[PDB]
From Swiss-Prot:
Binding site for Cu cation: H1
Subunit structure: Interacts with FCGRT; this interaction regulates ALB homeostasis. Interacts with TASOR. In plasma, occurs in a covalently-linked complex with chromophore-bound alpha-1-microglobulin with molar ratio 1:2 and 1:1; this interaction does not prevent fatty acid binding to ALB.
Effect of E356K: In Coari I/Porto Alegre
N6-methyllysine: residues bearing it: K532
Annotated positions binding Ca(2+) 1: E4, E242, D247, E250
Phosphoserine modified-residue sites: S3, S56, S63, S271, S417, S487
CC annotations in GO: blood microparticle; cytoplasm; endoplasmic reticulum; endoplasmic reticulum lumen; extracellular exosome; extracellular region; extracellular space; Golgi apparatus
Molecular function terms, GO-annotated: antioxidant activity; copper ion binding; DNA binding; enterobactin binding; exogenous protein binding; fatty acid binding; identical protein binding; protein-folding chaperone binding
UniProt source species: Homo sapiens (Human)
Name recorded for this polypeptide: Albumin
Outcome of substituting K571E: In Gent/Milano Fast
Binding-site list for Ca(2+) 2: D11, D253, D257
Site (Aspirin-acetylated lysine): K197
Record lineage: Eukaryota, Metazoa, Chordata, Craniata, Vertebrata
Effect after changing K311N: In Canterbury/New Guinea/Tagliacozzo/Cuneo/Cooperstown
């Protein structure tokens, strides 16, 4: 490996290389025009080829950080456009790179991306495919600077396929749109997840992170052994640390290494790991990261022997507390891939707590004798919540279910913005659709996956615009209590009903024209406001008032002279309803 670029150019291949150089440059110099980045990419790619032909060529020996930072610094409009960022160019390489990560803006001053009409895209996709997709890769990159390049390039490829496929179907829109919607949600899910771990790591430090990783790695590699798990948990923690920092190169290298490791010692980690290991450089770590839980050895002891029924428990504990507890997690985790990771941590913490008290008491072994009895309620709590909510989501579909929640949460935290309460209840409803379709054994892990982001998103908003100490409490609690905290919120009997507003419960015929999506959001916002106005109304009373409305919109969007039925019949409703409630 005389040349670093030549070597990466080779593993990566021209197509992927160019794409990644584009993303890398876009995530840094986020305010430079596309045509400019394209020039850079062609320069670097030309240089890289030069080195593939002669590893001895000028500058081919330099590092990726030196070449990258060197290219960034050549931009003549740097100072004028970026300013301070241009002062990094004065520093020595070591510090230069670090200076750039500092001025790497997360969430810049750029306009939201409006999605064109399927036919304009498709036509753009035909007359000129590379620059169509490159310009958009560029637009997405500059807006998500901390989004792991490769994982972004992965989505890019999926977008290209949607166009290749759909842009050749009689009814493109009916094809394309549903795909552009799924990918967007996935990209948005992916992004929130990444931001969410760098948050956890930062807030709760390495210990909790490691605890989290142990439980997760064990559920997936049950056949693996604690020594291997800890190994990976350590390397994994280094990786996340480095990737969160935002240094793509270091982060990439670290991931490539970790991937090679897992694959070589594959037989020692998991059986469901061949595919990923046969895949090319770029998709290896990504593949492994999404891997499925291996089947757990069918011959495995009872935690009660090595953790409860034993003596010398406190000795093994006091000898190396965290390692012992990590052993409890690894043991309990590989036996329960049907538990959420935080439920596992919830158990480890309960265990740690009794050990601390019992190992200090007269007859230890007897003090912590009935420890698993304490685990019981901690497990059924999330189990019942899931049973409860899926038993419900079944009867009244996604929309109606979205409405039951709306009523539920609006009543718990009325001070929240109506459009916010709609967004959350809307998301939570989709979680029900996504997860309730799974058998009991895969539900808890599913809910946790989705809720975790929703709950974090939820908390970020409250941060900027506080509204309730209660929400703040749950938001600033341990990630292990976060959800159960929210689940504990009660009806706000302090809240003072908001003033009746005729304008608020006044609807026109436009609703008949709007899309199912808009019709819903419209009626949904009305429901929130209805609860905000008469919060002490029964679920029965609310149903009645909601049925009259169902009829109202119908008997009005199917009526001669549409706008009077909405003005005349509406007046009646609001009048009847006021009296009913
Ligand atoms: C002029 C120098 C530019 C530097 C070249 C662009 C950086 C591309 C290197 C990224 C390689 C990523 C390898 C995949 C790692 C993984 O498995 O996650
Ligand atoms: C990489 C190329 C990506 C092209 C996709 C652009 C169209 C998507 C618009 C964004 C959206 O739908 O929200
Ligand atoms: C839970 C993730 C399990 C796979 C860990 C290995 C992935 C390394 C790439 C980040
Ligand atoms: C290989 C060693 C990994 C370390 C494992 C540590 C086990 C600790 C288990 C307690 C749960 C940690 C939850 C963090 C939230 C909190 O601080 O209460
Ligand atoms: C699933 C249905 C989706 C509806 C969302 C409201 C239910 C939330 C309760 C699920 C419990 C989450 C399990 C994770 C944990 O152990 O905290
Ligand atoms: C901008 C601030 C947002 C505040 C909105 C608070 C709405 C409550 C969200 C609760 C979701 C957590 C799921 C708990 C499930 C349960 O009810 O048990
Ligand atoms: C004071 C009373 C005001 C009464 C105004 C009636 C507003 C009710 C709007 C709720 C919307 C119901 C959506 C449910 C559905 O789609 O069937």
């Amino acid at each position: 490996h005389k040349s670093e670029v030549a070597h990466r150019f080779k593993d990566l291949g021209e197509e992927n290389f160019k794409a990644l150089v584009l993303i890398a440059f876009a995530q840094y110099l986020q305010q430079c025009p596309f045509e400019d980045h394209v020039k850079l990419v062609n320069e670097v790619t030309e240089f890289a080829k030069t080195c593939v032909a002669d590893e001895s060529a000028e500058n081919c020996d330099k590092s990726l950080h030196t070449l990258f930072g060197d290219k960034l610094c050549t931009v003549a409009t740097l100072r004028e456009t970026y300013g301070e960022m241009a002062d990094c160019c004065a520093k020595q390489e070591p510090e230069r790179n670090e200076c750039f990560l500092q001025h790497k803006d997360d969430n810049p001053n750029l306009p939201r991306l409006v999605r064109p009409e399927v036919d304009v895209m498709c036509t753009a996709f035909h007359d000129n495919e590379e620059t169509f997709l490159k310009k958009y890769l560029y637009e997405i990159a500059r807006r998500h600077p901390y989004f792991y390049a490769p994982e972004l390039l992965f989505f890019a490829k999926r977008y290209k396929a949607a166009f290749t496929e759909c842009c050749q179907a009689a009814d493109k829109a009916a094809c394309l749109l549903p795909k552009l919607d799924e990918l967007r949600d996935e990209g948005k899910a992916s992004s929130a997840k990444q931001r969410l771990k760098c948050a956890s790591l930062q807030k709760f430090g390495e210990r909790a992170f490691k605890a989290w990783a142990v439980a997760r790695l064990s559920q997936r590699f049950p056949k693996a052994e604690f020594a291997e798990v800890s190994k990976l948990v350590t390397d994994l923690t280094k990786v996340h640390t480095e990737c969160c920092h935002g240094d793509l190169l270091e982060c990439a290298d670290d991931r490539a290494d970790l991937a090679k490791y897992i694959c070589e010692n594959q037989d020692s980690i998991s059986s469901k790991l061949k595919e990923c290991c046969e895949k090319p450089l770029l998709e290896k770590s990504h593949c492994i990261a999404e891997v499925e839980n291996d089947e757990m050895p069918a011959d495995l002891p009872s935690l009660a022997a090595d953790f409860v029924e034993s003596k010398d428990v406190c000795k093994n504990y006091a000898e190396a507390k965290d390692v012992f507890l990590g052993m409890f997690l690894y043991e309990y985790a590989r036996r329960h891939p049907d538990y959420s990771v935080v439920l596992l941590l919830r158990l480890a913490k309960t265990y740690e707590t009794t050990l601390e008290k019992c190992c200090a008491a007269a007859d230890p072994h007897e003090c912590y004798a009935k420890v698993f009895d304490e685990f019981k309620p901690l497990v059924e709590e999330p189990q019942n919540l899931i049973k409860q909510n899926c038993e419900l989501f079944e009867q009244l579909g996604e929309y109606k279910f979205q409405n039951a929640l709306l009523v539920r949460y609006t009543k718990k935290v009325p001070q929240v913005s109506t459009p916010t309460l709609v967004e959350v209840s809307r998301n939570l409803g989709k979680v029900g659709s996504k997860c309730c379709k799974h058998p009991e054994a895969k539900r808890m892990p599913c809910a946790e996956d989705y809720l975790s982001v929703v709950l974090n998103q939820l908390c970020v908003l409250h941060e900027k615009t506080p509204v309730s100490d209660r929400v703040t409490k749950c938001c600033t609690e341990s990630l292990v209590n976060r959800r159960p905290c929210f689940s504990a919120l009660e009806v706000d009997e302090t809240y003072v009903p908001k003033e009746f507003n005729a304008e608020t419960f006044t609807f026109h015929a436009d609703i008949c024209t709007l899309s199912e999506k808009e019709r819903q959001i419209k009626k949904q916002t009305a429901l929130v406001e209805l609860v905000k106005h008469k919060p002490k109304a029964t679920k029965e009373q609310l149903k009645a008032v909601m049925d009259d409305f169902a009829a109202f919109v119908e008997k009005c969007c199917k009526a001669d002279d549409k706008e009077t039925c909405f003005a005349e019949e509406g007046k009646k409703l609001v009048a009847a309803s006021q009296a009913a409630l």
